[PDB]
Design a protein around this ligand. Structure first.
Ligand SMILES: Nc1ncnc2c1ncn2[C@@H]1O[C@H](COP(=O)(O)OP(=O)(O)O)[C@@H](O)[C@H]1O
Ligand SMILES: Nc1ncnc2c1ncn2[C@@H]1O[C@H](COP(=O)(O)OP(=O)(O)O)[C@@H](O)[C@H]1O
Ligand SMILES: Nc1ncnc2c1ncn2[C@@H]1O[C@H](COP(=O)(O)OP(=O)(O)O)[C@@H](O)[C@H]1O
Ligand SMILES: Nc1ncnc2c1ncn2[C@@H]1O[C@H](COP(=O)(O)OP(=O)(O)O)[C@@H](O)[C@H]1O
Ligand SMILES: Nc1ncnc2c1ncn2[C@@H]1O[C@H](COP(=O)(O)OP(=O)(O)O)[C@@H](O)[C@H]1O
Ligand SMILES: Nc1ncnc2c1ncn2[C@@H]1O[C@H](COP(=O)(O)OP(=O)(O)O)[C@@H](O)[C@H]1O
Ligand SMILES: Nc1nc2c(ncn2[C@@H]2O[C@H](COP(=O)(O)O)[C@@H](O)[C@H]2O)c(=O)[nH]1
Ligand SMILES: Nc1nc2c(ncn2[C@@H]2O[C@H](COP(=O)(O)O)[C@@H](O)[C@H]2O)c(=O)[nH]1
Ligand SMILES: Nc1nc2c(ncn2[C@@H]2O[C@H](COP(=O)(O)O)[C@@H](O)[C@H]2O)c(=O)[nH]1
Ligand SMILES: Nc1nc2c(ncn2[C@@H]2O[C@H](COP(=O)(O)O)[C@@H](O)[C@H]2O)c(=O)[nH]1
Ligand SMILES: Nc1nc2c(ncn2[C@@H]2O[C@H](COP(=O)(O)O)[C@@H](O)[C@H]2O)c(=O)[nH]1
Ligand SMILES: Nc1nc2c(ncn2[C@@H]2O[C@H](COP(=O)(O)O)[C@@H](O)[C@H]2O)c(=O)[nH]1
Lengths: 185, 201, 203, 199, 202, 193
């Protein structure tokens, strides 16, 4: 069986860039396709009536069907969700692992938001007003990655995922046969 | 700092993997156990072990100076409690290279202790490594091989398992565990308290 | 001249993923685009993953002796174009053939200097799980290939090197070491560093 | 069993330092302690770097057929103990012989499975700098023979160019890891995994 | 403020693939999309590899003084948009110009703090093989570019750093080491860790 | 000709341990054995860690102009032997001087091509922890205030990351025109022939 990961970060901290690089070196890991209001089905399932017909939050929603089958197949799964979703998932599925990604400074956040070139010259300040409040939830997460130097932060992220696959539970499923041979007198 | 328990059947590679880990990790220390085992060729008293006699090991035990002690392969081993208390209080990380009996004692007293079990890729690999090390006779290698399955059966009591097949890959596995812990909420809050404060300011 | 590599594995072992990651760091290496009569998987592009053809046009290409090797694999035909292999090697490029054990045997007979690497899973269940998790094949196809998995893996004894693809990053390093070690052989080093060697022995 | 390696190089190419770094990361690899009829260098320890013996005890050891190979390198005699090599391989350990081209030819005759690696400098002048900068007259005797030593590079399975040390160390590690990935080594090391895969 | 990098190389040395590999691991670094009059080879997208325009639109852009530098390379016009460079450096981003030696000299005059890196092949023949292996140049053009190879490579003396692109991965590491050492300079470390440094001196 | 490096740091920042790890992977690099009037430390060997002499023999060595630089640090005299530096550089080896900011200024005057690196801790308490776990703390801020005088700054937070930073500085310096022109003269000649 696989691990459920929650990855959260303020916009522009580097969560998208770190996860994409993590996936390139981690074939057993998938990323959940959120529904939100780019390619439909790849980045997101791109309305409210279908959503009301059945975690979810306004800041967006995570499809429940994909998660259940994926974990039972042994795949690890990353949810790129906000603190509201993280709280919902942690309540419904307490075994979920949570990782928070933070910038080295508030100004680096603004520079990255501005340098990404996807938001407006005022939405950067609109998102920054909520950025300090959003980052305050870092205390609710199992691990913290400070995305200063990208390469080091990628290593930090890979170490979390590798250490997790080395846990007792994961090693028992993946290396069951080796463990059996080791104890076979 | 963090207290680590590293255990393994005799000859899995626990000593050599930890030695290499320390070369890149000055903030981590390894505890020097007391033993009544006889010195191996190439071993130095005070570095690898505190080589003491049985009468004084038991004298040290009667003074309750041991955080844990156990009988392993017919010899007495124990961890000095004073050295552990001071080392953790200075902020250094600390590795105990002890058996499952010591591991259980330590886990009861310090539930936050992190435990790692190192496994060989096969049983025969243990005998080969014990033989290739060349520090132990055949009577000792055959005594430890009989208990090897018994030693490995406690692996289910450990937080993480490292399979020491290829040395460099297993060192990477080990470094990933130590790095993931240093990235936990508690460690990150202590280490980056000032940076975190500026972020919420 | 470049080196011809044969990379084989039971379906779902990770051979395509490992080779793709190898190529991102290895510009001197090319991978052969095989012909197949199989239908496309979701996300496959004609000319990139395979040259998709009909049975008829495959057998016509075969009657013209345009295949270095060919084989029937899980009910479909696959084959390596001979012209492309010859031209690439003569340019000094290294070349990977991602082919089955039947094709590998044909290539070894025609080109004895070819290097072969076999990629094994850590378990049989790992193959089924990886085939299922890739999501490009149906269930009947997966079961059909899993039925032959033990028979397929039995040919590992015919290969020069074995890579156990347990941890992907570790298996990628193992693969890079085989390639890097081949480029350090006497022949490759003599061709690539002919001038430096000449400077070294001149008094 | 393990792999027998022959590592050769003109004096000062970096063979000892590259092997030392390789040994620090490769516990399954041992390096042979050769016998020599030579005087220690500042820092050398008898039994670690060499078995320092006289020319009398060397030829007597030779007459007893105790050497796997022997050769004269600058009038000084060097040789590898056959007992030590035979014992180490049978335990499954890999073994490095740091010997010249003469020993390599002898070992290749007795053990065709031996792997040979020749370590080259980026230039002839870099050889002089490394010989001089290390800190052990002989350089002029060895530099005349350096071209002679390097000309035998054509006899070796692999060539490592020791230009940048770290890159040359990676090159060296790639050879050793690729060798452990060969059919024979993998068959011994993962016999149990292979059995489960075919069952 | 970010750092301006000039990366140059004779055709086929490996400059495009080495920078592409460096960028995949370095999000704080951007590469300038030059304007060119050359024809759009397959696989290239206007706005991705180049801003493909005609000679007429290029010279009109030049008359509007919208280029930081421009040069004729192998009969076509190439140029770096000055507005994009100025804004990108002012945002604190690092910037690579993959330009020839002519553009590099122009950039050095207007921006003497620009960092320049020259990439070299391990041999002239390796250059010919790589041009042939890339498969995007007639044999006539290859023979012509090899005639200019020695003249082009002679400009290596104008560059701060030389990377010999022999083994790709080793040359990629060399390049990353240059970039990492630059971000460790007094000025860069002072800007990025100004607050941490303040805590140290209190 | 090799490169002369100046590596400085407040006491306990990690300069000696980082340089030791760098040297294990850099055989072309040497570290200068300074003269000092301080007494031997745990495990210190005369000629290895320092050339331990007395204040009287140090000042005599100074009057003979045998030093490249000298300074009083924390109440003890320290100095670099000039002959060893000159010979080492002329042999083509790179050279590290583990000296304080006073020595760094003297060396920069005599050899302005010297590369200087300052190693900083992640926090002021980390120094106390590193010094304690392994008087100077009051002067630590004073020593660190000279960081502005150095070409490169390495923040020794995570040891392995700081080691990588240090290796990148040394590797980039060997990628400079002057260094590459000396080291690959024959290759460059072959390319331009
Ligand atoms: N460590 C880093 N240093 C500098 N820029 C970075 C770093 N990591 C990411 N970036 C850049 O910051 C911007 C925001 O990153 P992104 O992952 O898209 O944000 P988000 O956290 O909202 O998913 C991008 O342009 C990215 O390239
Ligand atoms: N992955 C490995 N492969 C082969 N030999 C190894 C490996 N790891 C360690 N060794 C060797 O096995 C022997 C036993 O290792 P050691 O750490 O001393 O055992 P222990 O687990 O009892 O502390 C040593 O000679 C060591 O060098
Ligand atoms: N070591 C691994 N662990 C888990 N999944 C892996 C590993 N290597 C590859 N995979 C995944 O297994 C699936 C099958 O891999 P692929 O290379 O396409 O198979 P094939 O060997 O048939 O070419 C893919 O989804 C791939 O991402
Ligand atoms: N790649 C290298 N570049 C520069 N100096 C090196 C390199 N490798 C080794 N050296 C140095 O060259 C000298 C000769 O190395 P050594 O291993 O002792 O020589 P040998 O090849 O004769 O065994 C030593 O001082 C060593 O530190
Ligand atoms: N070190 C290398 N060894 C072999 N081939 C390489 C190396 N680096 C790049 N190549 C290949 O050489 C060709 C030319 O590289 P490219 O970057 O496109 O050239 P340019 O220098 O003109 O930008 C490409 O096919 C590339 O994959
Ligand atoms: N990054 C680090 N994190 C934690 N401890 C470190 C780090 N780097 C070095 N140390 C330790 O700090 C102590 C002081 O290091 P050292 O190099 O001896 O100091 P100095 O800068 O005075 O030469 C040593 O015990 C060393 O192992
Ligand atoms: N709760 C929840 N948050 C999501 C989901 N998908 C994205 N988000 C969050 O929505 C925020 C805005 O992201 P963006 O606007 O770039 O798409 C991010 O913080 C992201 O983590 C989802 O499925 N559920
Ligand atoms: N409980 C306990 N076990 C120890 C201690 N020191 C070493 N051991 C264990 O004793 C066993 C025998 O080790 P050896 O004789 O090879 O040194 C190993 O499993 C080792 O981990 C100690 O202080 N306490
Ligand atoms: N003989 C041969 N086998 C091939 C060729 N191309 C693919 N195969 C093999 O056919 C099998 C099925 O591959 P698939 O349909 O999953 O892509 C794999 O083992 C693959 O290596 C080819 O050109 N020749
Ligand atoms: N044939 C042979 N050569 C040796 C032996 N030991 C060292 N050599 C070679 O003797 C030469 C001189 O080495 P040195 O004097 O620096 O130790 C080197 O080329 C080294 O490889 C040995 O046992 N046999
Ligand atoms: N001066 C200048 N040269 C450029 C520019 N863009 C590309 N080049 C150079 O033009 C040459 C031809 O490149 P290509 O035709 O392969 O894209 C290369 O040397 C490349 O570095 C530019 O904006 N300015
Ligand atoms: N100027 C100068 N400072 C030195 C020299 N050797 C050591 N130091 C500095 O003296 C200080 C005290 O170092 P320690 O007492 O731990 O050896 C350190 O900052 C060290 O850099 C030297 O030769 N010259």
């Amino acid at each position: 069986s696989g691990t459920l990961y929650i990855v959260s970060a303020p916009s522009g901290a580097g969560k998208t860039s770190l996860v994409k690089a993590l996936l390139d070196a981690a074939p057993e890991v998938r990323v959940s396709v959120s529904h939100t209001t780019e390619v439909d089905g790849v980045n997101y399932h791109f309305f409210l009536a279908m959503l009301e017909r059945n975690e979810h939050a306004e800041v967006y929603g995570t499809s429940q069907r994909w998660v259940e089958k994926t974990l039972a197949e042994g795949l690890d799964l990353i949810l790129e969700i906000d603190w509201q979703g993280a709280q919902q998932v942690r309540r419904l599925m307490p075994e979920a692992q949570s990782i928070f990604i933070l910038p080295p400074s508030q100004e680096a956040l603004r520079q990255r938001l501005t340098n990404r070139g996807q938001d407006s010259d005022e939405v950067i300040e609109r998102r920054m007003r909520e950025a300090v409040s959003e980052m305050s939830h870092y205390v609710e997460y199992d691990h913290l990655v400070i995305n200063d130097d990208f390469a080091h932060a990628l290593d930090d992220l890979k170490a979390i995922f590798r250490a997790r696959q080395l846990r007792q539970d994961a090693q028992q499923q993946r290396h069951a046969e080796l463990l059996g041979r080791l104890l076979a007198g």
